[PDB]
Amino acid sequence: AALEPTDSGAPSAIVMFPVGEKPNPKGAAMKPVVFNHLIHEKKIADCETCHHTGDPVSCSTCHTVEGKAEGDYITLDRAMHATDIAARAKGNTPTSCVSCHQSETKERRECAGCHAITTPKDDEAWCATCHDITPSMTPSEMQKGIAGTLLPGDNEALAAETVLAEATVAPVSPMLAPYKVVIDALADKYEPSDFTHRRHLTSLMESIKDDKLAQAFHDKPEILCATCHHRSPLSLTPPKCGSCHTKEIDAADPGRPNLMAAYHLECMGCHKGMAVARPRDTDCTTCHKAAA
Amino acid sequence: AALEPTDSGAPSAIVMFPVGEKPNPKGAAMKPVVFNHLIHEKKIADCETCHHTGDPVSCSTCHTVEGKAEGDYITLDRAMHATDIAARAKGNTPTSCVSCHQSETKERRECAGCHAITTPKDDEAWCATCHDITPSMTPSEMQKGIAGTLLPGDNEALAAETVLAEATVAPVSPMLAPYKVVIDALADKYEPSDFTHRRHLTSLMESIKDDKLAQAFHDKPEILCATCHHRSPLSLTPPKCGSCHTKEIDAADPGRPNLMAAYHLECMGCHKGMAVARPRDTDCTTCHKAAA
Ligand code: HEM
Ligand code: HEM
Ligand code: HEM
Ligand code: HEM
Ligand code: HEM
């Protein structure tokens, strides 16, 4: 039942609390975050990538909710979520939880296709992927974590309970969505684009099927459908692109591409993102045969 | 079952479908919208405010999904959700669903205080407030609604079943939130501000307790807490403002107010929005007495 021990001597899993000096008797705070150090140290080889100062200590020893000189007044909020971290001319460039994860999406070919075109969503389910404590923690325990007085045994117990109770959401099967879609809304100079809908989603899914970071944040069964079917409720029958993207110019919606450009930008955007060899963006017949 | 017949003669409630010419055999679309004509016409005096062309005919006779000349190519999506509609110098300026509802939040003092400072949120739960059809509608009926061959009695039956299954979420009691809060995060030149938390919420809630539009859209029990406790999961114990808002301007987040401006902008923002006589924004000591 015990969690697997780390090689490092860090706790296998640890509950991270909103550490600060301002009294917070009512526990006004996000849910604490249980961090799975085991999983992370197996994947990220350099301890100092994260522990950027070289010190094997809790980030909140320096980055408290309100900020303290040891962390150059960089707060807990900033240290955990910062998306725009400047490269340090000298020494280590720190990482945040959010910044490293986002990097994975851009630098790994299997992730960078979809993540070239996704409509970012940082909603409650996004926060909850990390702000994820077991319901068994009491207010009193929340207070001891804030105060640094929780005993390491209780931190372990809460952490283990939480990790043991996590479950990975399974993405809906590509069989529940079209096998192909004959995109013919605009057909004129070319024949329809016979989009291999199932072939596409199956392939994209297969390359990430065991990735623990994707599995944790792809956390609704239909969520991958939003990669293309964006800005509408998750659904097995989403609205057509052309319900929101007009064929002609739409100056009342300056940010929305017209329908041809919508297909081109989205289809070619992923192809570029994940370096798809064929079709190239300059290939004007592989996606749609020339009309008679 | 059947609904209350209207004075106008329109069906008491009407299912609105994604009407257009292009085949949609799989019903790729949002859920149809059940519009409560009865409730609307009892509140809105002039038929022409909505039926801007003067004749009470379905909007999608002119505003199809793809658009067409009889609607000046303004699509069904633009006609229902348009937010930035130009005032017409000749005749009736059209309204959309969204635009009139937004006007309500702005032009009515009981709505305009919170709505001067809320963090706008057009998420799935917002969409579903209107895209709200009974689960009993079958794909075949959806096809007939799209094609305009659904029998009027069938439309009626679907709308009545939908309306009669509607649920209003009750907002949590202000007794579940603090009576008063000593706001002392920044205490220095002034004493802490002893904010009348419960009196504020209770008062704001009292004034909208019977409003059907607010009731539909305020659709999570803790949603009203988000008026002030924004950008975090709905919670009875949200994070402190100062967990995200730093004491001094952070150059890393230069559009995020610092903590003092966070309080001032929020507190004075609603006060201005709903024409609160006192405190004026210059009545400093009213919100925080000078420090002895
Ligand atoms: C989602 C948008 C989200 C929000 C909101 C959020 C807020 C936030 C706050 C305000 C803090 C500071 C402490 C407090 O409770 O006031 C906090 C701290 C941590 N966060 Fe967070 N956070 C959200 C998103 C996420 C995501 C997606 C992750 C993981 C990648 C994450 C991580 C952390 C960690 C770690 C902490 C410190 C521990 C704690 O104080 O709970 N956050 N977050
Ligand atoms: C490399 C193998 C490595 C070491 C060693 C290490 C140590 C370490 C310790 C001793 C702790 C506990 C500190 C405390 O005083 O409680 C700890 C905690 C955290 N670590 Fe770590 N760690 C190593 C690797 C990494 C890597 C690669 C990551 C980033 C992906 C990382 C992150 C963290 C975090 C976050 C914590 C929790 C701090 C808290 O607030 O509880 N570690 N680490
Ligand atoms: C714990 C593993 C930990 C995290 C995570 C963390 C993150 C972090 C961020 C993202 C920054 C950069 C912020 C920016 O806006 O540029 C940052 C910067 C500093 N930190 Fe840190 N940090 C972690 C832990 C610790 C430790 C334990 C301390 C104190 C010993 C600390 C200190 C600092 C300071 C100082 C800086 C500034 C460095 C710079 O080059 O500006 N961090 N941290
Ligand atoms: C590749 C293994 C991969 C990673 C890693 C990954 C991570 C990831 C995160 C962390 C999120 C949350 C939002 C954020 O950027 O922090 C996220 C969200 C979505 N992803 Fe993803 N993802 C990877 C791969 C893929 C693939 C192959 C697809 C397309 C099929 C995909 C799409 C999605 C979508 C949709 C979301 C939600 C919207 C968003 O916030 O981007 N991801 N992913
Ligand atoms: C995720 C599993 C998902 C589902 C569900 C889904 C459904 C869906 C339907 C029902 C159609 C309509 C077909 C018709 O007109 O009869 C459709 C059409 C398109 N899809 Fe899709 N789809 C899902 C996933 C994805 C993904 C991840 C992408 C992009 C890689 C994608 C793309 C498209 C496109 C393009 C179309 C055509 C829409 C149009 O031309 O209006 N879908 N999908």
Ligand code: HEM
């Ligand atoms: C159908 C699968 C479809 C495609 C294709 C499509 C593409 C598309 C692109 C390339 C953009 C620009 C980049 C981006 O994602 O921001 C874009 C922009 C918006 N879309 Fe779209 N879109 C598809 C479907 C839909 C649907 C069904 C809607 C309406 C519910 C919708 C709406 C929007 C909007 C809004 C934006 C603009 C965002 C902004 O920058 O202001 N799209 N889409």
Ligand code: HEM
């Ligand atoms: C090569 C650069 C290229 C050209 C040229 C091109 C043109 C084009 C037109 C004019 C349309 C409108 C429909 C018509 O038949 O006139 C059209 C629409 C689609 N395209 Fe395209 N297109 C070029 C390249 C690409 C590539 C590489 C892709 C696939 C990644 C692609 C896809 C699409 C799709 C989908 C549509 C919609 C088809 C329809 O609605 O009939 N195009 N393109």
Ligand code: HEM
């Ligand atoms: C929430 C952001 C939301 C989305 C997304 C959205 C989309 C949408 C589309 C794409 C259409 C056109 C037809 C289609 O199904 O393809 C459509 C049509 C209607 N809408 Fe809508 N809609 C969203 C939000 C809302 C809300 C909050 C309202 C009510 C104020 C509303 C209303 C309607 C109406 C009425 C229609 C016409 C009937 C229909 O086609 O279902 N929408 N919407």
Ligand code: HEM
């Ligand atoms: C004023 C008292 C008034 C009249 C009269 C009126 C009539 C009416 C009819 C007869 C219908 C049905 C149309 C059809 O052919 O199916 C209808 C439908 C809608 N109405 Fe209406 N209506 C009057 C008042 C108003 C008011 C003030 C509004 C806006 C708040 C409103 C809106 C609508 C809408 C929307 C519908 C449904 C149209 C659809 O596409 O199905 N009406 N009305």
Ligand code: HEM
């Ligand atoms: C457009 C077709 C449209 C839709 C859809 C829509 C929806 C809607 C709902 C879901 C509510 C809540 C109560 C109910 O279920 O009926 C509601 C309430 C009112 N609305 Fe509305 N509404 C649409 C159109 C419009 C228009 C064009 C206006 C103003 C001209 C408007 C106004 C209002 C009013 C006011 C209310 C509350 C009525 C009350 O009894 O207090 N709506 N609407």
Ligand code: HEM
């Ligand atoms: C006054 C009677 C009033 C109305 C009307 C109203 C409407 C309303 C709607 C239509 C929404 C959905 C979002 C949109 O703008 O379309 C919405 C959302 C929220 N409201 Fe509201 N609301 C009225 C009053 C009040 C009052 C007095 C408060 C504060 C106590 C309040 C709060 C909010 C919150 C928060 C939201 C969600 C976030 C957002 O989308 O604004 N409203 N309301």
Ligand code: HEM
């Ligand atoms: C009147 C023009 C005015 C001034 C001046 C003023 C300044 C002020 C300061 C300097 C702060 C920091 C706290 C301190 O004690 O130094 C501060 C804080 C808050 N204020 Fe203020 N303020 C003025 C006006 C207003 C008004 C009219 C309100 C109420 C509507 C108000 C609100 C607040 C609150 C709340 C805070 C935080 C208090 C704390 O954390 O100690 N102020 N203000």
Ligand code: HEM
């Ligand atoms: C909705 C019912 C709601 C809840 C729940 C909520 C709770 C709450 C908490 C627990 C506190 C912390 C108090 C403490 O630390 O002693 C708190 C504090 C403040 N709130 Fe609140 N609150 C709810 C709603 C509202 C509303 C609608 C507003 C704005 C009108 C509001 C305001 C605030 C403010 C300001 C504070 C102080 C926060 C700080 O100084 O960090 N709340 N609330």
Ligand code: HEM
């Ligand atoms: C923000 C923390 C904030 C402060 C501080 C504050 C104070 C304040 C004073 C001192 C009064 C007069 C007496 C009283 O306590 O009622 C006053 C009254 C009203 N306020 Fe206020 N106010 C703060 C915030 C807000 C917010 C964010 C709103 C609207 C969402 C709001 C509204 C009101 C109302 C209305 C009044 C008048 C009395 C009533 O009818 O309840 N306040 N506030």
